[PDB]
């Protein structure tokens, strides 16, 4: 069995190996990358996403979200408070202000200590889930706006044509902006490209151990757990590496820098934070190996998780027994 300790693998494809996306994901899996739940892909030196980032300041962040925490330093939830619209240029200035800027630090490890110690006492502002792309239309390799769609993958594997579309999302982050413990909708893959700015630290639980994380989460968030049998779908719970180690949950950590891709694998629980002002782009995708994970994915039916139009057909076709109850939660 390849990668039996489920370590995060890092790949350095040549320009020739960067041509065929599907083939390269399948190569990574042949080496055991999926066992970690997360992999890093460093693009060939010849490659670029676009010529410059000099003209992005007029992008609108229509609903910036202030991430307010409750709980204790290592075990907390966050809720998103909606703020007034601002441009990327306005947001970058805010990120760099004395109230919100990255503190002085020695190295990534010192910054990670400061995050875990102090996150709860601040409420950073995140520009999340903004439909759009920063890839140049002429970038032919690993362009997240030109991937094969999940609807076409289900059609190719299963023979059923379905409605729905699949487009990327932009994330503008600042110091301490946080992504809570989750897997993707329908336990899909994701791919994330860090276009510019400061790093993003990730934590991940191997897919084979995901239920261990879920059991801990039910213990640590006992009211949430009673309200919904899949409450990590709400994307609001944080658990620190210290707490995970104290409870024996297997995980790994890695920092992504500007110009690097990360791939999350089906049922790979992940969480993390941004080091300072940055812009990432991400999208879900599928392969043939995903289908069995989609069929088994948990669902939130309490009404909190509320998701895209395109998840309907996935539930309808892969999980027909669940469909009725899940749609009640959507309406
Ligand atoms: O970058 C973020 O805030 C969160 N991204 C992801 O969870 C992802 O790409 O799967
Ligand atoms: Mg602009
Ligand atoms: Ni994710
Ligand atoms: Zn729920």
From Swiss-Prot:
Enzyme nomenclature, EC number: 1.14.11.66
Domain of life assignment: Eukaryota
Cofactor(s) recorded in Swiss-Prot or TrEMBL: Fe(2+)
Reaction(s) the record says it catalyses: N(6),N(6),N(6)-trimethyl-L-lysyl(9)-[histone H3] + 2 2-oxoglutarate + 2 O2 = N(6)-methyl-L-lysyl(9)-[histone H3] + 2 formaldehyde + 2 succinate + 2 CO2
Biological process per Gene Ontology, one example term: positive regulation of chromatin binding
Cofactor note: Binds 1 Fe(2+) ion per subunit.
Protein name as catalogued: Lysine-specific demethylase 4D
Organism whose genome encodes this protein: Homo sapiens
Gene that this polypeptide is encoded by: KDM4D
Residues of the full protein shown: 11 to 341 of 523
């Amino acid at each position: 069995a390849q990668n039996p300790n489920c370590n995060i693998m890092i790949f350095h494809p040549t320009k020739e190996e960067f041509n065929d996306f599907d083939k390269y994901i399948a190569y990574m899996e042949s080496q055991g990358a999926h066992r970690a739940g997360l992999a890093k892909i460093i693009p060939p030196k010849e490659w670029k996403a676009r010529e410059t980032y000099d003209n992005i300041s007029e992008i609108l962040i229509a609903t910036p979200l202030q991430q307010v925490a409750s709980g204790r330093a290592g075990v907390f939830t966050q809720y998103h408070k909606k703020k007034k619209a601002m441009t990327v240029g306005e947001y970058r200035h805010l990120a760099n202000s004395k109230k919100y800027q990255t503190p002085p630090h020695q190295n990534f490890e010192d910054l990670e200590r400061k995050y875990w110690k102090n996150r709860i006492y601040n409420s950073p502002i995140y520009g999340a889930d903004i439909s759009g792309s920063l890839f140049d239309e002429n970038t032919k390799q690993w362009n997240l706006g030109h991937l094969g769609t999940i609807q076409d993958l289900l059609e190719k594997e299963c023979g059923v044509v379905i409605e729905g579309v699949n487009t990327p999302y932009l994330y503008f982050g600042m110091w301490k902006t946080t992504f809570a413990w989750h897997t993707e909708d329908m336990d899909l893959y994701s791919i994330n490209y860090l276009h510019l700015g400061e790093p993003k630290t990730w934590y991940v639980v191997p897919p084979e151990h995901g239920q261990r994380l879920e059991r801990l989460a039910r213990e640590l968030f006992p009211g949430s757990s009673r309200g919904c049998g899949a409450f990590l779908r709400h994307k609001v719970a944080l658990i620190s590496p210290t707490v995970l180690k104290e409870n024996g949950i297997p995980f790994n950590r890695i920092t992504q820098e500007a110009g690097e891709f990360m791939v999350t694998f089906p049922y790979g629980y992940h969480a993390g934070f941004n080091h300072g002002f940055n812009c990432a782009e991400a999208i879900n995708f599928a392969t043939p190996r995903w289908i069995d994970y989609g069929k088994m994915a948990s669902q939130c039916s309490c009404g909190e998780a509320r998701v895209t139009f395109s998840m309907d057909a996935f539930v309808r076709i892969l999980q027909p027994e669940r469909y009725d109850l899940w749609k009640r939660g959507q309406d």
